Design a binder for this molecule. Sequence first.
Ligand SMILES: NC(=O)c1ccc[n+]([C@@H]2O[C@H](COP(=O)([O-])OP(=O)(O)OC[C@H]3O[C@@H](n4cnc5c(N)ncnc54)[C@H](O)[C@@H]3O)[C@@H](O)[C@H]2O)c1
Lengths: 169, 210, 422, 58
Amino acid sequence: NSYKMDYPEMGLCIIINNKDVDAANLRETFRNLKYEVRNKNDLTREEIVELMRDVSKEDHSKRSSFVCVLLSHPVDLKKITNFFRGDRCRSLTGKPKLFIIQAKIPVEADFLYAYSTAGSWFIQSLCAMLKQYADKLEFMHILTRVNRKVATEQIPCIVSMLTKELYFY
Amino acid sequence: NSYKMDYPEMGLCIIINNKNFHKSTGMTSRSGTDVDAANLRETFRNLKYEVRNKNDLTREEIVELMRDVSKEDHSKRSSFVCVLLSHGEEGIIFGTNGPVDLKKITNFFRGDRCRSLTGKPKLFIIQACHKIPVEADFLYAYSTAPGYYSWRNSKDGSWFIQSLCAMLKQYADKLEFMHILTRVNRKVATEFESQIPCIVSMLTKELYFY
Amino acid sequence: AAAAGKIGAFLRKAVAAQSYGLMFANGKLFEATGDALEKRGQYGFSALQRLDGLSRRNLAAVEARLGALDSAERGLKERIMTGAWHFRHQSNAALDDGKTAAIASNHLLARESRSSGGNTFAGDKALLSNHDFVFFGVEFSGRGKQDKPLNHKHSTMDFGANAYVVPDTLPACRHGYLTLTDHFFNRVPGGREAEHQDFVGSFPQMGAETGRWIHEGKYRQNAPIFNYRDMKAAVALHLIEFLRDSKDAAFKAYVFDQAMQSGQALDRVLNSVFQAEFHIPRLMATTDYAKHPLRPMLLKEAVDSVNLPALSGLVSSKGDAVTAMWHAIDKGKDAVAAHLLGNWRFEAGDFASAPPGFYHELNYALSEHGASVYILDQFLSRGWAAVNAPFEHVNSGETMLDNAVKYGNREMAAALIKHGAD
Amino acid sequence: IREAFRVFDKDGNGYISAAELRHVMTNLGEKLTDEEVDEMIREADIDGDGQVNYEEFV
Ligand SMILES: NC(=O)c1ccc[n+]([C@@H]2O[C@H](COP(=O)([O-])OP(=O)(O)OC[C@H]3O[C@@H](n4cnc5c(N)ncnc54)[C@H](O)[C@@H]3O)[C@@H](O)[C@H]2O)c1
């Protein structure tokens, strides 16, 4: 059925900010979900590919999921997703790897890239629905209501390969 | 909210099936495919759809009939489904004569140019063998990279289509739509893989076939 | 008198050369790997000796990879290369002729009027071009040819419902070649889908090694081929190398204790590690064989591989007559339709709806891609098909002449304009 | 090479040495099957099949 989301400890939520209230908005809303938040401030144009590579080196087996909010404004994710393929990152196997991006898609086993338009409308709606509805609807439906709110007020494009449902409770 | 598919009938279902290909382009025979269109026609016509099967279309016939089905009428229709079974390799569907990009097909169904179909689903099931056009209420579901290496015991059908038809005949009455496409992802991943379908969703509401 | 033996063997050598020159002139592996010969209508003994040169290097290369071996496996290499082998054909056609067996290739059968329906595809005639060979599956049990074949299936296909077992002492086998897998599908089935699950099931954690291990992973398809001389050493010499790179208890349990019982404890060992295949040249004819009916034949394959004596025994009422006729409508079986049109008396009301298992209407099936013109002519000029009625289910709005002009069938477009109007 | 050249004793003449006599000798002297003999005769058939012209087969 759904993903089993009750590990002893919850996965990382490394928020790679770049260049601002949305970053603080994201930090508070993902802290409420009992995550581990790691705010990284402005980086270079090549930034730190080792930042999440070193994340793929620890033991995530006690961590249930993973989130990488790449909030930016020239490094592709193909050289970033490759660290979490599940074979060279066997620790993160059969468990969600969400990539919430706002400014080529690599097909993999369990990924979800919620790419959006170039606080902004996307983040404000994204945090609000998680504040309200993150008790009955799965992650798909919160992304759908966020999809409705942004266009009706230039649209999010969910791309998912998850083999199971996803509930945050 | 939801799409309120309480209109007097649901929309159309259009199936494009290409098996025999021009030898100039250099394509395989691709046998064991007419069963898929048989499953798909019975499955979609089961709910409420008017299935239109179209075997072995050309490079221009695919474009022309879509421009014909786009501008006919949909004011009494609730949805719209399109299915493509071909021998494309890239994110483009190959016609029997020449490759056709997916973008041209969907330009006729935008809310700008298909105001009879606005605020309504426009499903697109693609089974190749991803230059997505962004537009609200669309939904594309690619399934590329077959090749599980069947021996001279040739494959009867195809994993994605049979899984899609199987899970949709019972579950598509109380279990949403994106809750079904994930199960199609799971069944292909677990029971078949000893590459995987993608769900590029831009729907602004939910979809219930009941 | 006895001098006719030299011509009897010289010409049998002569006929085998041409089926080898074809494969070493056409095909792409032999072009890319340097094993190609120049194309010519009349081949010589250059084609035959090239198999000897190519088989030795295949044997030498796997020989060098192994050391001097030990006395433990002498009860393995010597056991295999001194046994008895019996090949098995398993085809659905009529190959008896009373007390002979005229099994023919695909090129010979298609050279003249044929009764074909085999399992060759495009690419096989292009990548390899080995269609002038008669294929067999090997049995290593060494029992009598008159007892039973205990391996009813090749890699995955069940090629027929009548096995034709032949001893490997036949004079026609001396010019074939052996390949440890299918020559075009260089992949052993492994464990989960391999037959005889009661054997592989009892022995786990080597089925992964036998799973999909390809052979000669140099060009990913450059399959090894061995002579008749080297076909017995290689199945055992390769078996040891696979054992050497393996780790289990079946390594020592039933490979070095089966040497005393070379029956079901040796046939199932070699038929699971490898998937053997023998390729006799153009034609194999002998009076020394056996026909074992494995399973009763269905009606579909009695139509595809045209077998009229069996087909006539299968049909009992007109209900099966139309079903057999619907099978002949597809596949373009001209000979089957003519046979059925002489026995039963049909009517246009019979061909009004596609029977279960058929996905097209009568007018579309007659004008399909590979459909036959003879059946179309016998339907139009018999009051059974409406020439100008349009399709109503698939590609609707079109007529038969549209199909003929799309697929480029001048012999069917001319037939349609004549027998009808369109 | 010469042994197989001169083994064709039943020749009568150099160029004309088989006609259809090859069909006769194989099925009368050994136990060859006719379905295979005729295919065997199909090769080397230019209606006279000269012996020397068929020794360029090496
Ligand atoms: N038959 C086998 O046991 C076997 C074994 C190993 C591999 N294969 C592989 O599978 C493929 C199948 O080859 P195939 O053996 O089915 O043959 P094929 O595709 O080359 O065509 C031959 C067909 O003609 C039939 N036939 C032979 N003599 C006939 C006759 N006198 N009258 C009427 N029909 C006659 C044969 O039964 C066979 O059905 C081969 O290309 C080979 O790659 C087959």
